[PDB]
Design an enzyme around this catalytic site. Structure first.
Site, PDB file in Angstrom:
ATOM      1  N   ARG A  23       0.840  -1.166   0.000  1.00 36.78           N
ATOM      2  CA  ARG A  23       0.000   0.000   0.000  1.00 36.78           C
ATOM      3  C   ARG A  23       0.891   1.237   0.000  1.00 36.78           C
ATOM      4  O   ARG A  23       2.088   1.177   0.351  1.00 36.78           O
ATOM      5  CB  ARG A  23      -0.868  -0.029   1.241  1.00 36.78           C
ATOM      6  CG  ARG A  23      -1.828   1.103   1.410  1.00 36.78           C
ATOM      7  CD  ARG A  23      -2.746   0.903   2.625  1.00 36.78           C
ATOM      8  NE  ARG A  23      -3.690   1.993   2.760  1.00 36.78           N
ATOM      9  CZ  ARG A  23      -4.357   2.285   3.846  1.00 36.78           C
ATOM     10  NH1 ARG A  23      -4.199   1.575   4.959  1.00 36.78           N
ATOM     11  NH2 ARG A  23      -5.200   3.298   3.817  1.00 36.78           N
ATOM     12  N   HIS A  24       0.323   2.377  -0.376  1.00 33.24           N
ATOM     13  CA  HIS A  24       1.025   3.629  -0.111  1.00 33.24           C
ATOM     14  C   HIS A  24       1.289   3.755   1.384  1.00 33.24           C
ATOM     15  O   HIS A  24       0.646   3.126   2.191  1.00 33.24           O
ATOM     16  CB  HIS A  24       0.199   4.821  -0.603  1.00 33.24           C
ATOM     17  CG  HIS A  24      -1.202   4.828  -0.078  1.00 33.24           C
ATOM     18  ND1 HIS A  24      -1.515   5.244   1.199  1.00 33.24           N
ATOM     19  CD2 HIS A  24      -2.360   4.391  -0.629  1.00 33.24           C
ATOM     20  CE1 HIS A  24      -2.818   5.112   1.387  1.00 33.24           C
ATOM     21  NE2 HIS A  24      -3.351   4.588   0.296  1.00 33.24           N
TER      22      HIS A  24
ATOM     23  N   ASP B  43      -4.943  -0.100  -0.312  1.00 32.20           N
ATOM     24  CA  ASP B  43      -5.482  -1.097   0.607  1.00 32.20           C
ATOM     25  C   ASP B  43      -6.514  -1.992  -0.055  1.00 32.20           C
ATOM     26  O   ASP B  43      -6.471  -3.198   0.131  1.00 32.20           O
ATOM     27  CB  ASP B  43      -6.060  -0.465   1.894  1.00 32.20           C
ATOM     28  CG  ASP B  43      -7.093   0.648   1.642  1.00 32.20           C
ATOM     29  OD1 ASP B  43      -7.368   1.042   0.473  1.00 32.20           O
ATOM     30  OD2 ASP B  43      -7.705   1.187   2.601  1.00 32.20           O
TER      31      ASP B  43
END
Ligand SMILES: *[C@@H]1O[C@H](CO)[C@@H](O)[C@H](O)[C@H]1NC(C)=O
Ligand SMILES: *[C@@H]1O[C@H](CO)[C@@H](O)[C@H](O)[C@H]1NC(C)=O
Ligand SMILES: *[C@@H]1O[C@H](CO)[C@@H](O)[C@H](O)[C@H]1NC(C)=O
Ligand SMILES: *[C@@H]1O[C@H](CO)[C@@H](O)[C@H](O)[C@H]1NC(C)=O
Ligand SMILES: *[C@@H]1O[C@H](CO)[C@@H](O)[C@H](O)[C@H]1NC(C)=O
Ligand SMILES: *[C@@H]1O[C@H](CO)[C@@H](O)[C@H](O)[C@H]1NC(C)=O
Ligand SMILES: *[C@@H]1O[C@H](CO)[C@@H](O)[C@H](O)[C@H]1NC(C)=O
Ligand SMILES: *[C@@H]1O[C@H](CO)[C@@H](O)[C@H](O)[C@H]1NC(C)=O
Ligand SMILES: *[C@@H]1O[C@H](CO)[C@@H](O)[C@H](O)[C@H]1NC(C)=O
Ligand SMILES: *[C@@H]1O[C@H](CO)[C@@H](O)[C@H](O)[C@H]1NC(C)=O
Lengths: 458, 458, 458, 458
Positions: free
Chosen positions: C69-70, C333
């Site tokens: 995820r980021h 996510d």
């Protein structure tokens, strides 16, 4: 109150760790609030030097001496009065508190609701705090039996030595119960309650009480020169959020101790949240100053008082044939601090300055006497020699230039010379003006002398 | 190898906590192995005094200077080769190792696989250690941007000043990369590589190099007076378990560095397991002594050398109007130590004793220059006054008698007087016997002078 | 604000330790606020099972796949609007806030002062928070090179795979910079920016975008049956201290996310202090419910979307001759969560209940996708066999009934059968209604296809 | 031995922290060695769910029941003698041990010096371990008084219920001593020693003893299906380093308990260092299996046996008016496990698999009965309703579908229905084939029945 508020003792956040590989690369202990609260807040271990507290390999425990303060307590009668007053002064603000003091709006109760607790050890019976002093003392007793227990012959009564301060006495008892476990009874433990009356002279766990010539305030003047400007800045910050707030720097100063005791009593105090580290540090140094100049080497009468127990301790060290090898003494911070003035291991070479804040404080009062303070003398044999060393709040503190033995200990022969030099030219009877007992005897005569002073509420 | 072995940095187990209410009542940081490894082992934060490192409320950042050591590294050539020689002596023992040295039997490889890594930063590329020097520098850069980046104008190139030592230079680049994040490029950062050539004189991040009268070894005979008995005892212990083991006290002494370096390189060292705390502490003090007498006030020449960077730094603080507010300088421990000889905030009043082990060490080399050492000067405005303070390895270290500003800082006016006092009677050209540059100019003339020395492997 | 307030993440105090010998006997991780904030707050490691994350002895790393995820970010545009509104609603209270909300009086600024930061990774450039997402990603890159770096041939370009979400992209970049260190440049790293447009079909890091038949709200009804009564109780408590306070349960619900993001952005949030653990736990379960039923196995379309990357990952696993052994994929996510619906390792056997709060939540959303989430597939040889295992947020998560290999891994042959069974009867083109790419190709065709989608602000 | 070795309980090093901003983002508790030692090793708190263990605000304590295991102990006779036999097999290896087993060369003593300690609590008196069972019980008593003591009337004797097992009985006394502090005496505490004799039937803290149809070994053949291959691999590893080493898989299996016990006894065990995490985890699951199938719902007889204490406990909760509000019961892990078979809060829906290793274990024996295990029922009033909840090893464990009360508690009315459901169709006399007492009466008739069984060494 959120478990994110006041849920530890550290005046630092996670920021300390942000550029580390391991959290063990961080130094966060320095930020422990207790270290700034002048020995009023809960027990904390001495920073120490990294010396292992284990008895060194190839050494065998010969003797141990504990000199312990009472554990954490409620405020004194005097302090309680001050804190209750400042609480009442605060509560009588007409207005809603904002900023740091906002907690004062939230049905904030005074943390000593029953004055019968003033002067008492905090305990599971009178306190919800994990920092209860009796708990501290019991856990210590346990730990202490774990480490030094081989010196204990279970066919022997354990003697306990305590002043008649109720909280010191109760400490000694919780300690002994920790130590003895399910063997604790009226028969396996004999407590010698050593009166704090001046008429005990040097035969005392509080020999300062018999020292008439000792003036604890001989140096109040120099101590008052230390800046109190941080108290003004803090007061001003409180006023900025609370216009009309009628408190003074005196009130503010009282709130560091208020913080310390509410912490003791409740386990957390919103009062702790109103100060910056920098205020804490300056408060803390004002306490070091006060204690150094009243209770330690800044006062020219503490050497002689301190030497009474240094001598007695040394006598115990020199008498290897005594059946009892475990010396358990309980008393106040001041006595332990004055004892340390004579020990000379945590005493600066020069008097403390007041015209600036030194870093570190050359004299750290909380490093010697936090609540539950413990000054331990270990004696152990290594080969054909006996060695002595100090463990002050769980840190080995080597005697300067007598730290060659295993675990940075002092050969007992060298320790003799060290003590001789520390006590040179002291004379308690003569310097103190007291013709009662000239020396400690209670370690030796307690079987034939009844030390059963009644407990005082102090 | 069990994760229970060498899984941390602390020379203490859980017994530290056994009678506490909160683990925060424990003092375990004294036991960190790094603090005894003389600056060779991974970065560690200075023990500090509890001063919040945050810029004080109502204070505005004006300037920051960073003086950074290279990060964690492989051994230097000399040390690495000495470690290899000891390793080979150990491997040629004929016999199965027992006791502390048993790990030597277990296909124990020498930790420097390729000698090309000698002198180099450990990094994710040449090392599987979390303690990698480049990681340390990169994380530091990030943290530093997070703290000080309001001072950075993104229309301006970031200047970096580094010596031409490979490890130092690489540190500067990892730091700059951490600092600049995804903005990092040869356009946004300009690195000035300042040669370690003696012809640089005082216009140098390593001014000791051009100081001809500086003898780092002037005091070796003093230093060598300090006890080596612990080496003999350690050796005899190794021999006791390994009859006929043929290594010297010199070898054993090198195994401390070997430990520190294998820790850096591998993230854990079995060699760290062979010493007692008491040996590490004496080892540590031998290093404090050597560095105090070679690189600090023990050596009469370091104040003049250190004063070059102290003056330059002061010129920077005095000059309000420079568009550049973030000074990033990268050099060796030695240069930073000598710098600190002139800064004078972590310098003892007197020369270190050799005839016993002081506690604490009056001069703590690792408190100043651990691997990845960071000496920071913050300058900030509070009201109409500017304040200066030092943050050494993440701890504010107030200047003695100049710490009454906010955050225990020094008014720049007062800081001027302090610097003048520190540098009084110094003269680089004359004291050093070097007629090349007499002062630092590289912070100002780096846009017209091409500072572009080629990298050396040292 | 006092460093005793909000200085960590734990919703427990020292009370946890009070009857322990060692602090390691305590379970305090359960109280980490992050675990209750639905993946919005900073990165946290998966609770895990105690399985060592090291490659087992006698095994050799063959391949690694990261799906990340980021890192931590500012609120989205949508959320920012909600939080700014609730802040404005709160601030427009006429009255002085008391109780938990008292901080609202203290010149409390909205934590997103510039809306240009909405949707962005927090970074040292736009945030003072130690939890900056770019920092998280850089540190991860570093750690990741440290562990898996032997798989990296420095003669090769590192390919990076990222969706065109600006924050995902920036994550991928900070990650790659951490990984590459001072070797990072336009030539050593090739980033393939994989468009989030629906027309990418299964050839996507966000294959849900091309899945037209996927309705993330197919189960909103069942999720709405979960109690919201804790929101009323909390609202009522706020009103009790603040009469006339005009906010709703909707406002209150928004304050958990407000807490999470202010934490991200500022590193600490007073908004976090207004809820009890019990409210946090119920909020947290409402998020698990929402995500389970939208993004995981409760939604009957996530298997097929999730299988696109399960298949591609498996293809990578099966092709041992590819020069590149390091697969770095960055996305959201939801994509990672849907991927996990297909992986099947953290998916409950039954749908989540709504008529009570289960303990534990059978589906832990934050255990899969915290900010900076990392789903790693390790491949390594042990003897004549290859094994595969998952490391989800730094915990090994064994595949059920395929965990016999070293480190509780799955023989690649068995992993083939496992994936086959997970993806049985999936058909992306057909179940999704999208006749664009039917399968992932970008891992293989990125050299001849230009993945350079422009960055979107989401 | 180096303080770097075995200085903690975690099977992970600092690498867990290496890419985090805060160490609180790490999940290291999964790695605690205790959790893999099957309840044999020291106390550890249940992983839990983040539920505050505090009595909820606006709730008033009404009652507490403690069901406590004995604290940490020396090995039982059987195990101790098996450990001694393995020790002797190892000592008779002729050869120098290398690798993980090298510590065996180092004057490695067997950890039970005197066989009189078998079966006994470790204590400060017989042990130098911080993990001493009596210390654990004493600290627990203190903590318990601190939490629950408002429920204690000091005009009333504290009743204690314990089985007549020596270690159990001693636990009860250390607990009571912790609880009562300096008020502890034979007057303030009355201990009811409830015999483990089968003739006690259901009127027993060990009702399994009077259950004749209960076969703890009924399911051994199922349990024995679980893999032992890890034992062979561990053994082969030991053999590889120690050619001709003659021990079995059985021996190796016993070395896990040896590790757990030496840890209890000594505070550290070199024997703990010989296994990988992966071996501990499989070992751990073999114990979960054995205990699930012997002492929990795997065995058809445990629900009937467990229901005796579940019923009795419910009778106590239902009875408002008893002057005594604090129930303190001390017994074995087995009894508490069987009790939990009927409580049904930590019981999996289905029987444990044997043909693979599940993650997590659906039944965690150590989550229920570590040494010093504590199962607590708290009953408290919130408004006009009473609520019940379980705190197992310091974690609230909500009852499935009965957790909507404050603190995830169960309304006593609902708790009645739950218990009735749990005990439905049970009949001790008939199912057990025992016509002695049919129900527990000792909590009520202990003032008229003399419960005074003599202590047994088991
Ligand atoms: C125990 O103490 C008694 C009374 O002090 C003494 O007479 C006896 O010698 C001791 N017994 C042992 C076994 O040491
Ligand atoms: C000892 O001290 C007490 C109290 O000061 C005093 O009454 C008494 O006279 C003293 N005794 C002698 C012999 O000085
Ligand atoms: C300590 O003992 C010495 C004798 O060794 C003596 O001269 C001195 O008076 C003593 N000091 C005190 C205050 O007891
Ligand atoms: C430092 O500057 C002073 C003037 O401030 C100068 O006279 C002195 O020589 C300088 N010292 C060095 C060593 O650069
Ligand atoms: C500068 O340093 C060089 C190199 O060490 C030295 O040889 C030379 O004499 C110096 N030059 C001057 C002008 O003093
Ligand atoms: C490095 O890469 C180039 C271009 O891809 C390739 O032709 C060459 O074989 C590689 N060199 C080495 C030493 O592997
Ligand atoms: C792929 O998807 C895009 C967007 O939905 C659409 O315009 C295009 O028609 C699709 N292509 C095919 C072949 O279905
Ligand atoms: C996964 O691959 C299988 C072939 O192994 C195929 O039948 C299925 O369609 C694939 N699923 C998806 C959604 O890509
Ligand atoms: C528990 O109590 C019920 C009535 O509540 C009874 O019928 C049942 O037999 C009891 N179970 C046991 C095993 O004591
Ligand atoms: C009670 O238990 C005893 C001892 O196990 C057994 O022999 C006896 O038959 C039982 N008595 C009754 C009344 O059932």
């Amino acid at each position: 109150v959120s478990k994110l508020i006041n849920n530890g003792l550290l005046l630092v956040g996670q920021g300390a760790y942000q550029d580390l590989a391991s959290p063990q690369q961080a130094s966060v202990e320095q930020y422990n609030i207790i270290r700034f609260l002048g020995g009023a807040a809960p027990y904390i271990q001495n920073k120490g030097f990294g010396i292992s507290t284990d008895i060194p390999d190839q050494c065998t425990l010969e003797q141990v001496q504990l000199f312990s303060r009472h554990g954490e307590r409620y405020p004194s009668t005097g302090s309680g009065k001050k804190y209750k007053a400042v609480y009442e002064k605060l509560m009588s603000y007409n207005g809603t508190f904002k900023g740091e003091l906002a907690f004062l709006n939230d049905d904030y109760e005074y943390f000593v609701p029953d004055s019968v607790y003033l002067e008492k050890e905090t305990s599971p019976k009178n306190s919800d705090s994990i920092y209860a002093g009796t708990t501290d003392a019991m856990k210590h007793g346990i730990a202490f039996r774990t480490k030094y227990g081989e010196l204990f012959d279970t066919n022997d009564t354990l003697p306990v030595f305590t002043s008649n301060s109720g909280r010191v006495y109760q400490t000694s008892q919780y300690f002994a119960r920790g130590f003895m476990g399910d063997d604790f009874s009226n028969d396996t433990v004999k407590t010698n309650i050593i009166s704090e009356d001046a008429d005990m002279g040097a035969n005392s766990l509080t020999p300062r009480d018999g020292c008439f010539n000792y003036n604890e305030n001989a140096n109040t003047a120099i101590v008052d020169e230390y800046t109190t400007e941080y108290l003004t800045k803090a007061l001003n910050r409180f006023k900025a959020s609370n216009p009309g707030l009628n408190i003074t720097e005196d009130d503010v100063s009282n709130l560091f101790g208020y913080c310390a005791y509410e912490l003791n009593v409740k386990g957390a105090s919103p009062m702790c949240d109103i100060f910056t580290n920098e205020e804490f540090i300056q408060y803390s140094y004002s306490v070091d100053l006060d204690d150094y100049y009243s209770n330690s080497a800044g006062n020219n009468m503490t050497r002689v008082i301190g030497s009474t127990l240094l001598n007695a301790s040394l006598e115990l060290l020199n008498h290897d044939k005594n059946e009892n090898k475990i010396w358990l003494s309980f008393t106040h911070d001041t006595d332990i601090e004055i004892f340390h003035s004579a020990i000379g291991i945590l005493i600066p070479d020069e008097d403390l300055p007041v015209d600036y804040t030194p870093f570190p404080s050359p004299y750290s009062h909380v490093g010697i006497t936090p609540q539950g303070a413990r000054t331990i003398i270990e004696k152990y044999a290594c080969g054909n020699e006996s060695y002595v060393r100090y463990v002050i709040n769980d840190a080995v503190i080597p005697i300067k230039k007598c730290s060659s033995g295993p675990g940075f200990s002092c050969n007992l022969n060298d320790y003799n010379d060290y003590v001789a030099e520390r006590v040179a030219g002291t004379n308690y009877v003569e310097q103190c003006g007291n013709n009662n007992a000239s020396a400690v005897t209670f370690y030796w005569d307690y079987e034939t002398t009844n030390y059963t002073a009644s407990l005082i509420n102090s």
